Amino acid sequence: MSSLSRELVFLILQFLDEEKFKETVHKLEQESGFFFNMKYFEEKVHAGEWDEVEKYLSGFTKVDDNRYSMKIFFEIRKQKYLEALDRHDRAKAVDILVKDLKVFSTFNEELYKEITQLLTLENFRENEQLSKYGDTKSARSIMLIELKKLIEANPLFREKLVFPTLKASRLRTLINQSLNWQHQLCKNPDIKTLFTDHTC
């Protein structure tokens, strides 16, 4: 990708936001990987929408790219697991533990075992490390604070966290110039389409 193409994506991002196509903004952020939107990320984590959280992240890093992003996913999947326990859905909790958390066992055998054994507790708050764990809303928040730090420190995100500065509607402004350029080649004083060059 040229820096021109990269820049064009940003213009498009601004346009999409101005027209309030909200979901399209974040799919473009994700698939281009040019801008990580914190505000959005926080919003989704607080809402506990974990499938979207992991999907949004997957546009910026894989699980094993580096230890920062590895702790990021670990935290996310851990909280997913605990919420499953807290609604007493042990079928879901085990599914998470095998599909999501197993990748971390290679690197930590002992923690995975300790994580597994929470399945047999009346309340995981019986474990002394998890004893101070509260309402779901509060746990998400605590973890979010940690995630923000992990993202800000992650070398893969470091140049992606701040939106560039632009006058409103830059794309519409550029489009305007192309219409000016086209007609300035015409032999007379109506723009019908953007689809084919204008003439008079």
């Binding site: 702790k71 971390f104 923690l111 994580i115 998890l130 764990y133």
Partner: peptide, 8 residues
């Protein structure tokens, strides 16, 4: 920091 715990 980096290392994985079972904390907050």
């Amino acid at each position: 920091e980096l290392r994985l715990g079972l904390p907050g």
